[PDB]
Amino acid sequence: GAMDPRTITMHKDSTGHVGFIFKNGKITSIVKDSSAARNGLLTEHNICEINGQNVIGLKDSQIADILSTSGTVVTITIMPAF
Ligand SMILES: [O]
Numbered sequence: 001g002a003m004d005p006r007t008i009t010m011h012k013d014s015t016g017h018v019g020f021i022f023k024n025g026k027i028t029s030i031v032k033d034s035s036a037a038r039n040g041l042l043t044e045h046n047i048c049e050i051n052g053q054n055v056i057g058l059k060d061s062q063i064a065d066i067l068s069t070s071g072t073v074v075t076i077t078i079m080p081a082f
Pocket of ligand 1: 047048049054055056077
């Protein structure tokens with residue numbers, strides 16, 4: 001629910017992308033018509049886990065690298081914040 005973590009499974013498109021951008025670990029925009037959009041990834045939520053790995057505290061370059069090098073399945077657990 002509103003306060004709670006949610007886990008979203010996405011699949012990469014033909015160029016290896018799932019459909020979002022982020023900054024300082026927070027998702028900031030979803031790409032229209034993407035896997036992220038279809039599967040309900042949310043903006044203003046922090047990236048907690050990717051493919052079951054906790055990434056809290058990692059810098060953006062590392063989160064980016066994990067996303068870019070992932071296989072086609074990308075599962076992300078996200079968390080709201082105030
Ligand atoms: O997390």
